[PDB]
Structure 1
Amino acid sequence: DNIQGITKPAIRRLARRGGVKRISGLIYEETRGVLKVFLENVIRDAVTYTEHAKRKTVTAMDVVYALKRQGRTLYGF
């Protein structure tokens, strides 16, 4: 609903860590929304490896292969 997983100071820290000097007040909602989607796409795909491989506990490695499946971005050739 309105449940969030990252705090506003958390967001400024990550922005700072990315080299961002200043941030619009509108960035908080957008960052969080972006984080909802990312998490959805990963968790959904991770549910596959647990449920079609029969288990009830999602392992560390359940998420790992789910992550390997998301497409990896590099910054050169």
Structure 2
Amino acid sequence: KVLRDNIQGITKPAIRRLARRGGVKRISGLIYEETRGVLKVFLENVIRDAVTYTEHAKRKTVTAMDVVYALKRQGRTLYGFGG
């Protein structure tokens, strides 16, 4: 029921694709797991606030405008889902 490993669900080729979108052509092997940790850090940084909004709404299911709020708190305002 519980989950233990999904950080490896972000595969090395997916990271390679993102770096090609980032304009990176050559990637060290040390990159991938450290970037997994960094993005994971960003993930609880956003999802803690998202959960806080969700419980403060007296909802158990996470809704998208809560995510919109939590992303504009980090100076990372997202367009196309507000409202």
TM-score by length of 2: 0.79
Aligned length: 77
Q: Is 2:82 the partner of 1:74?
A: no
Deviation at residue 35 of structure 1 after TM alignment: 1.1
Distance 1:75 1:27, change over 3 A: farther
Runs of 4+ residues deviating >6 angstroms: 73-77
Gaps of at least 5 residues in structure 2 are none
Distance 1:25 1:75, change over 3 A: farther
Give distance in 1, aligned partners of 2:29 and 2:60.
Answer: 40
Gaps of at least 5 residues in structure 1 are none
In percent, how many aligned pairs have the same letter?
A: 100
Distance 1:46 1:34, change over 3 A: same
Q: Which moved more, 1:25-34 or 1:64-73?
A: 64-73
CA RMSD after TM alignment? 4.5
Q: Conserved in 1, the CA contact under 8 Å of 2:7 and 2:36? A: no
TM-score by length of 1: 0.85
